[PDB]
């Protein structure tokens, strides 16, 4: 996980 | 002179000069360069090793993540010298260690535009010219070495  | 984030440094344990990006954390003995902004969009792979702290401290690597921060620095720091050694491949090492599911497509999070992804993971990806690979970034799923394939 990223993604903001 | 030198493209964005890329300054001339030298080592306070040694005194050899380098090159340093303050928005990858890239470092580099080679000179970076010899109205253009940044690409609109880009496609990144990402290698995350994930510490105690992180938002989610679980990864298909093991449910349950204890290492410190500095343990997963001294990690990443480790692949990041691999890498650049050749001893080992930057897609062969997101398979098998990073903490993040993309692990399952050799670290390949596909393209995303500004506003997509975590604030310092961005600012990273879009000052990567094609093929480059950052340092140690740090957002709060943990540590990450990101390199912009597209």
Known sequence: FXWR | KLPPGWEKRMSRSSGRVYYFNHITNASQW???????????????????????????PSS??????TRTQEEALELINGYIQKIKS???????????????????????????????????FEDASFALRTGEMSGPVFTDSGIHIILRTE
């Open chain 2, 86 to 120: 050749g001893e080992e491949d930057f897609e062969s090492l997101a398979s098998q260690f990073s903490d993040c599911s993309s692990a399952k497509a050799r670290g390949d999070l596909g393209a995303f535009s500004r506003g997509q992804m975590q604030k310092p």
């Open chain 2, 60 to 65: 298909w690597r093991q449910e349950q993540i």
């Open chain 2, 30 to 56: 080679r000179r970076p360069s010899g109205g253009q902004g940044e690409p609109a969009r880009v496609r990144c792979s990402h290698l995350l090793v994930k510490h105690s702290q992180s938002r989610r």
